[PDB]
Design a protein around this ligand. Sequence first.
Ligand code: XAV
Ligand code: XAV
Ligand code: ZN
Ligand code: ZN
Lengths: 284, 284
Amino acid sequence: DFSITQFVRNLGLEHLMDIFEREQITLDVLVEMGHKELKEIGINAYGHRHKLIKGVERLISGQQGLNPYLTLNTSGSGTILIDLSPDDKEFQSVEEEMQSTVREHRDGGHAGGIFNRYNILKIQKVCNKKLWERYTHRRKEVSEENHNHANERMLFHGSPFVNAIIHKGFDERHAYIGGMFGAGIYFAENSSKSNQYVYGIGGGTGCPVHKDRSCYICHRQLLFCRVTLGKSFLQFSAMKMAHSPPGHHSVTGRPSVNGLALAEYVIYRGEQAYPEYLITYQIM
Amino acid sequence: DFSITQFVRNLGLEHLMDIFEREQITLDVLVEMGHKELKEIGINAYGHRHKLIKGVERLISGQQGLNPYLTLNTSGSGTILIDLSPDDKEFQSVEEEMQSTVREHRDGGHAGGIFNRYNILKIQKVCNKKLWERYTHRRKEVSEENHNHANERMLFHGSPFVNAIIHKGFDERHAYIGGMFGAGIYFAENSSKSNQYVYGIGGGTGCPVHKDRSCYICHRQLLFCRVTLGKSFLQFSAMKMAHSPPGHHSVTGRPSVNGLALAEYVIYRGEQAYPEYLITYQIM
Ligand SMILES: Oc1nc(-c2ccc(C(F)(F)F)cc2)nc2c1CSCC2
Ligand SMILES: Oc1nc(-c2ccc(C(F)(F)F)cc2)nc2c1CSCC2
Ligand SMILES: [Zn+2]
Ligand SMILES: [Zn+2]
């Protein structure tokens, strides 16, 4: 509460600090208060309100180059998880997407274990204001290209760094270098394809508690994400690109007889995806 | 014309009719004027403005059951077409989609004619506020039923009734009964496929002038539309349907060895597609 104390003292309004302390008025709150709000907490004199508002203007606008607003607006940020009710139809729709896209992989369940269905434990909507705004800015940029069409999709993504993703967003600096299309973020439309990467490439060593890639006890996590594809480059064979091809925004790997068994979608910029749903589950 | 006169006379404010006539104030305009605007046009007495505003309130709200607002606010509606600049990247993107999706059809160009590319003449953005609002209402409805995902695509549609579509909107009451998937509205991701339907089923008799399906002179018009698919039902064989299958919002036809040569998308409600671009072109 020191910053607001110095701000008020520099104005010669120290005698209002009792009011400010009682109402828990910190500088971050004060910079968002006009005449009405200040009157509401008992600053009855117009002169004091005028001095306070002018001082706030001088700090925020007059010193914009220092970006004092950003350092004052760190509170309230971060990610929050909102549970979906199992009876709500959005929960059921996500569950139907999760269950109905299961496929039998070419390997005999080696990478992601053996199963046919899932036991869904909970479904959470991931809300992060800054990450969502970054996603929307990039989505609008992509839609201005490609004739006002974002080519948005909802796709799956498995990764042992889901916590980092939901708290910091997708980052191409952590791209999957070994991917078939090279140094991108990979998304699948079959949830069981992405389930093979919950414990890392090729299933890793499996679950940490039992070192089992087919463990039926441990709670797994997956992300069901909004992905902006824009104008997508189709490919049937492996390529080692570091970015999207010229004039395009993503790569769509198509299934082929001698190639992919299932579809793949690759983006080369972290801001073109947003992890909307976090799904906790076990395999059967 | 007279409506404003009767409205003002009933209020006993006949002496303001000179002002209302000089400023071309009609009732539909009057009902959108507050104290500020009325003072602007020179109604200086607070009492006269108060009486006019209360009269407007009694008409619009006190008689809401008769919907005078809809009768008054008919002016300003209707479709307009905005030309896209050929140098604009939006025009270039639409043209690129148009040209790149051309395909060779099983028939020897019998329906749509023989060509490898198009001579693009004009591209226009179709703006109609009422139809757009209806489309967005349906889109929100669908997204709420498909885990917050509308599943929006941009596809081609060719039809001899394009003017009716751009002025009145898509209507399932004019559905294509003869299609493989029933009485729906059909869209394609290949421009040539839709081009086969510009002059009717099987190309009809061709252009009105030369009665040639492969005419290289007459202008043609294609629609490139937003289509809300929601949860789409995937089919590989024909089956005549009246509406979308239970739990689904559209039907997506997939190519097959013994089935479809090219993709196909069918909606069963008219308000699930908005014609965004009107493409005027010639086959070459
Ligand atoms: O969902 C997916 N995740 C990954 C994946 C994620 C993280 C990592 C890493 F641990 F960071 F190196 C590696 C691979 N790869 C794929 C898919 C689904 S489409 C097929 C490829
Ligand atoms: O773009 C398309 N239009 C039509 C079409 C439009 C109007 C009419 C009618 F004359 F009004 F009855 C008939 C057919 N059919 C299809 C496509 C592209 S997907 C394949 C089918
Ligand atoms: Zn385990
Ligand atoms: Zn002709």
